[PDB]
Structure formats: C-alpha cells, structure tokens
Amino acid sequence: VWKDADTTLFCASDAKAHETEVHNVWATHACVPTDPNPQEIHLENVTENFNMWKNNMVEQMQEDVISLWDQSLQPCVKLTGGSVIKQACPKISFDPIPIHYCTPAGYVILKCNDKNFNGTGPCKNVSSVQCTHGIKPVVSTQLLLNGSLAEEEIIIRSENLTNNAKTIIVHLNKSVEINCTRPSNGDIRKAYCEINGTKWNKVLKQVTEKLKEHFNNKTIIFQPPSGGDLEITMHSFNCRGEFFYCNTTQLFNNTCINGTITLPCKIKQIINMWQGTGQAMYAPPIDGKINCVSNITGILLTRDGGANNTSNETFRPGGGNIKDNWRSELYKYKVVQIE
Numbered sequence: 247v248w249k250d251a252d253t254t255l256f257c258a259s260d261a262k263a264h265e266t267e268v269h270n271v272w273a274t275h276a277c278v279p280t281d282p283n284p285q286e287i288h289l290e291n292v293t294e295n296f297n298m299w300k301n302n303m304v305e306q307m308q309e310d311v312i313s314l315w316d317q318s319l320q321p322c323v324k325l326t327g328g329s330v331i332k333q334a335c336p337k338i339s340f341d342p343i344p345i346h347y348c349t350p351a352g353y354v355i356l357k358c359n360d361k362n363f364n365g366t367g368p369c370k371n372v373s374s375v376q377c378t379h380g381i382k383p384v385v386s387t388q389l390l391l392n393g394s395l396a397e398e399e400i401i402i403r404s405e406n407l408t409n410n411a412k413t414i415i416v417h418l419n420k421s422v423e424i425n426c427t428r429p430s431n432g433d434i435r436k437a438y439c440e441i442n443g444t445k446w447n448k449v450l451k452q453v454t455e456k457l458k459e460h461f462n463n464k465t466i467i468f469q470p471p472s473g474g475d476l477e478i479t480m481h482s483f484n485c486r487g488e489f490f491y492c493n494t495t496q497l498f499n500n501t502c503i504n505g506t507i508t509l510p511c512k513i514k515q516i517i518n519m520w521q522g523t524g525q526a527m528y529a530p531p532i533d534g535k536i537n538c539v540s541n542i543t544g545i546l547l548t549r550d551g552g553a554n555n556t557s558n559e560t561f562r563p564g565g566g567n568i569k570d571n572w573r574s575e576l577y578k579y580k581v582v583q584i585e
C-alpha cells in the first residue's frame with residue numbers, strides 16, 4: 247500500500263569526474279552513479295491520479311538547476327534587490343547532461359505509461375521505478391530543446407486551457423532540428439538559426455489540427471509575442487555558455503499552412519535572470535564558430551483573451567517560468583510513500 251507524499255529526492259548521473267564541464271562537475275559532487283540494471287514493476291489493474299501542475303518533483307529539480315547555475319554561471323555584475331554584486335566572469339565549458347531523479351527508502355516513484363497521457367487525470371497503465379529517465383536541465387523559452395518526444399500523437403498540456411493565463415505545453419511527437427551558429431569570420435554578437443521550413447511547417451500544421459480538437463474546431467492562428475521582455479518575445483537559450491536571443495517571427499506566421507528558415511539571432515551579455523533575481527551581465531562572446539544543433543521537442547504557447555465572441559483562437563510563443571520546462575519531462579512521474 248502507498249500514498250501520495252513529498253520527500254527529498256536524490257539525483258543520479260553518468261558525469262565524468264575529470265570533465266571541466268559545469269554540469270559534469272556539479273553532478274560529480276551532487277549526484278551518484280546510475281543503476282545499470284534499474285528495476286521497474288508494472289502495476290496491473292491499478293489506477294493512479296497524476297497532476298503535473300502540482301508536482302513537488304518539479305520544484306526540486308528547479309532547486310538543483312538554480313544551484314548548478316549559481317556555482318557555474320556567476321556573472322560579472324549581478325543586479326538584484328537594489329544590490330550590486332561584482333565578481334569574476336570566467337568563460338566556462340557548458341553542455342547539459344541527463345540527470346536522473348530518484349526516491350529514498352520507503353518511497354517509490356510511480357510512472358504513467360499511457361501513450362496519450364496529458365499530465366492530469368487517472369492513469370491506467372502505471373509502473374513503479376526508483377529513478378526517472380535522464381533529463382537535461384535545458385533552460386530556454388518559446389521552444390523546448392533536446393527533450394523527450396511523445397510516443398504517439400502530439401499532446402497538448404495545460405493546467406486549464408479555458409484559462410488563457412495558464413501556459414500551454416505542446417509536446418511534439420517528431421523532432422525538428424534547429425541549427426544555431428555564431429560565425430567567426432563584424433558584429434561578434436550577430437548570429438542565426440536555420441530550420442527546415444518544410445519539416446517545421448508540417449509539424450506546426452499538425453499542432454494546429456491538434457489544437458482544433460481542444461478548442462471546438464475554432465480557427466487556429468499563430469502570432470509573434472505582442473510585448474514583454476526579450477527573454478519572452480524571443481527564443482532565448484544558452485549555447486556553449488553564450489546566451490542566445492532569436493527572433494521567431496518566421497516560425498509563427500500563418501502563410502505557410504518551404505525552404506530554409508534563417509532566424510536572425512543575437513548574443514546578449516545582459517540578461518534577465520530566469521531565477522527571477524534580477525539582471526546579470528556576462529563577458530563578451532568567445533571567438534570561433536559557436537554552434538549548437540538542438541532538437542525542438544516542444545513549444546510553449548500563451549493564448550490571447552477576448553476571442554470568445556469570435557471564431558479565431560490566437561496562440562503566441564511564450565515562456566519565462568522554467569518550471570514548465572521541467573514539467574514537460576516530469577509530467578508522467580509522482581512520488582508516493584510505501585508502508
């Protein structure tokens with residue numbers, strides 16, 4: 247017998263003890279080796295209720311990533327609470343690695359295995375595991391990168407679709423590579439991201455049809471953010487330690503519903519910390535070809551209000567709350583206490 251409960255989890259990874267890469271260094275001192283032969287018991291005729299939007303696991307992973315960033319990515323100048331903190335800003339080696347989250351004795355993680363599970367409600371096929379799958383602490387906005395893919399159909403996730411204030415999580419079932427590069431040899435901060443239009447437009451079309459099922463077949467329209475900070479109005483992410491802000495206006499237009507989509511990007515040194523502490527400044531970009539090839543596995547959308555009396559539903563790319571990022575991976579997990 248068991249019951250829903252919250253306990254301090256521990257992490258596990260395959261980090262290299264000799265790697266200077268920040269993630270490997272952190273997991274080396276904060277995590278333990280992964281289990282080569284992990285056990286997984288499938289519970290038959292067992293119904294369990296999940297709620298990705300109220301999962302303490304998310305808060306804990308958030309706490310780790312914050313700690314990891316505080317120890318690895320300390321800015322030269324930190325502006326928070328009216329206070330000004332000045333420190334060293336040494337360039338580091340940055341590349342996220344899979345992090346497993348496990349439960350201690352007396353506790354076990356329940357995993358929903360329903361192909362089209364949407365994060366909330368009862369789960370028919372449930373199994374018990376000691377640790378979650380390897381999850382990369384990839385911090386980004388608008389587009390979810392290097393995440394897990396849906397096994398069957400594209401899944402729309404939301405704590406309450408009827409409420410436009412609640413962020414929407416689109417879980418893709420097919421990856422779409424996005425190639426971002428900062429050429430060496432001008433503007434050392436000017437960069438660009440290349441996406442396969444044909445591949446993207448088709449996926450975006452599938453996402454559209456999917457949204458129709460959830461919005462009574464209302465016309466689905468995409469539009470670029472109306473306002474807000476750059477971290478939200480643009481696809482912000484970290485590549486090789488550099489903060490990239492990409493203009494995603496060519497991705498979210500409703501005309502192509504076929505060549506190579508080239509997004510105008512730019513590396514920023516001054517960023518609005520996702521930890522919600524304030525502003526932080528980092529050193530200028532390093533030299534050489536800064537390139538990161540990521541797989542788009544999800545999209546964060548915010549729906550416009552005041553469209554009740556119309557047949558249109560406008561969706562814009564959003565983000566800001568990195569917790570939603572962890573939810574897109576921890577949705578099928580929950581901790582229970584055993585007795």
Ligand SMILES: O=C(NC[C@H]1CCN(C2CC2)C1)C(=O)Nc1ccc(Cl)c(F)c1
Nearest residue numbers: 386387477482483484518519520522566
């Ligand atoms: O500034 C951001 N979000 C708004 C905060 C304010 C207060 N709040 C935190 C209490 C939870 C959300 C942000 O996401 N920055 C950001 C920075 C770097 C990257 Cl690579 C990125 F993808 C996003």
Ligand SMILES: *[C@@H]1O[C@H](CO)[C@@H](O)[C@H](O)[C@H]1NC(C)=O
Nearest residue numbers: 359360361362370371372397
């Ligand atoms: C999960 O249970 C359903 C019936 O409720 C079954 O059809 C399916 O095969 C099980 N797992 C999957 C997704 O294969």
Ligand SMILES: *[C@@H]1O[C@H](CO)[C@@H](O)[C@H](O)[C@H]1NC(C)=O
Nearest residue numbers: 392393420421422539540541
């Ligand atoms: C990118 O996605 C592809 C599947 O489309 C996968 O083979 C590859 O391992 C992914 N790379 C990552 C997650 O870094």
Ligand SMILES: *[C@@H]1O[C@H](CO)[C@@H](O)[C@H](O)[C@H]1NC(C)=O
Nearest residue numbers: 398399400401419420452456
């Ligand atoms: C992705 O999901 C959609 C439904 O949302 C489905 O029509 C499509 O076949 C899926 N694609 C793949 C490659 O499974």
Ligand SMILES: *[C@@H]1O[C@H](CO)[C@@H](O)[C@H](O)[C@H]1NC(C)=O
Nearest residue numbers: 364365366367402403404407
């Ligand atoms: C998820 O599935 C449950 C099944 O009861 C449903 O009640 C809920 O509306 C779904 N959530 C979304 C975001 O579609």
Ligand SMILES: *[C@@H]1O[C@H](CO)[C@@H](O)[C@H](O)[C@H]1NC(C)=O
Nearest residue numbers: 405406407408409410411412
């Ligand atoms: C979902 O959002 C709508 C609109 O704000 C609200 O009226 C409704 O109470 C919400 N549903 C739940 C279950 O809270």
Ligand SMILES: *[C@@H]1O[C@H](CO)[C@@H](O)[C@H](O)[C@H]1NC(C)=O
Nearest residue numbers: 425426427428429440537539
């Ligand atoms: C990524 O884009 C650059 C152009 O900036 C190109 O030279 C490179 O071959 C691309 N990589 C892949 C794997 O498409």
Ligand SMILES: *[C@@H]1O[C@H](CO)[C@@H](O)[C@H](O)[C@H]1NC(C)=O
Nearest residue numbers: 442443444445446448505506
């Ligand atoms: C773009 O994607 C399509 C499939 O959607 C593929 O057939 C084509 O080879 C891709 N183009 C490039 C330049 O890789």
Ligand SMILES: *[C@@H]1O[C@H](CO)[C@@H](O)[C@H](O)[C@H]1NC(C)=O
Nearest residue numbers: 457458459460461462463464
């Ligand atoms: C959308 O339209 C299709 C085809 O008429 C219909 O089968 C389906 O019930 C509709 N979905 C809605 C209104 O959610």
Ligand SMILES: *[C@@H]1O[C@H](CO)[C@@H](O)[C@H](O)[C@H]1NC(C)=O
Nearest residue numbers: 470476479480493494495510
């Ligand atoms: C994104 O780029 C487009 C290019 O037409 C531009 O019009 C728009 O102002 C840009 N948006 C932001 C957030 O700067």
Ligand SMILES: *[C@@H]1O[C@H](CO)[C@@H](O)[C@H](O)[C@H]1NC(C)=O
Nearest residue numbers: 443495496497499501504507
């Ligand atoms: C929409 O996206 C396509 C991608 O090829 C781009 O060519 C076009 O200029 C965009 N339309 C806009 C920004 O109005």
Ligand SMILES: *[C@@H]1O[C@H](CO)[C@@H](O)[C@H](O)[C@H]1NC(C)=O
Nearest residue numbers: 391392483484538539540541
């Ligand atoms: C996504 O994964 C690829 C392959 O490991 C990696 O090269 C790239 O840096 C990752 N992208 C981000 C945004 O971390």
